[PDB]
Amino acid sequence: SMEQVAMELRLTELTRLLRSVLDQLQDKDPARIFAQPVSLKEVPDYLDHIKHPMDFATMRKRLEAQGYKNLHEFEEDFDLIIDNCMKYNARDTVFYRAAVRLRDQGGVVLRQARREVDSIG
C-alpha cells in the first residue's frame, strides 16, 4: 500500500536523523572507549555483571537495519552504554569518567534531536 510506503519513508528519515545523532554522540568519545563491545575474551565475567551489553557498533548495526522505531528506543541503547560502564567500573577510573563526560555532552545533542523528531514528525 501507499500508506506502508509513507511509513517506510518516515522510518527512513528517522534513520537519517538518528545516523547524524549517532555520529555526533560518538564524537564525544574520542578515546573510543565505547566503540566496540566489551570483549568476553578479555573480560570473561562481564555478563555476570552486565545483563544487556551495548556499544556504538552494535547500535550502528541496528540503526542500518532500520531497527529503531522511535528516538526513545535509540536513547535506551545510548543510556545502556553509559549506565553499564558506570556500574562495572569504579568512580576513579578512566572508563567511568569517560561515561560521565559522554552522558553530559550527549544530553545537549539529545535535547535538540527530540525537538527535531517532534518538529519534523
C-alpha cell at 78: 545510548
C-alpha cell at 71: 528516538
Measure Cα distances from 99 to 12, 68, 89 in Å: 29, 22, 10
How buried is residue 36: exposed, middle or buried, by Cβ count under 10 Å (0-12/13-18/19+)?
Answer: exposed
Q: How far apart are CA 107 and CA 86, in angstroms?
A: 16
Q: How far apart are CA 34 and CA 81, in angstroms?
A: 7
Output the DSSP codes for the chain: -HHHHHHHHHHHHHHHHHHHHHHHHHTT-TT-TTSSPPPTTTSTTHHHH-SS---HHHHHHHHHTT---SHHHHHHHHHHHHHHHHHHS-TTSHHHHHHHHHHHHHHHHHHHHHHHHHHH-
Q: How far apart are CA 53 and CA 2, in angstroms?
A: 38
Q: How far apart are CA 83 and CA 87, in angstroms?
A: 6
Resolution value (Å, 1 decimal): 1.6
Domains and CATH numbers, the chain: 1-121 (1.20.920.10)
Q: How far apart are CA 90 and CA 50, in angstroms?
A: 14
Phi-psi region of 119 (alpha: psi -120 to 50; beta: other; left: phi over 0): alpha
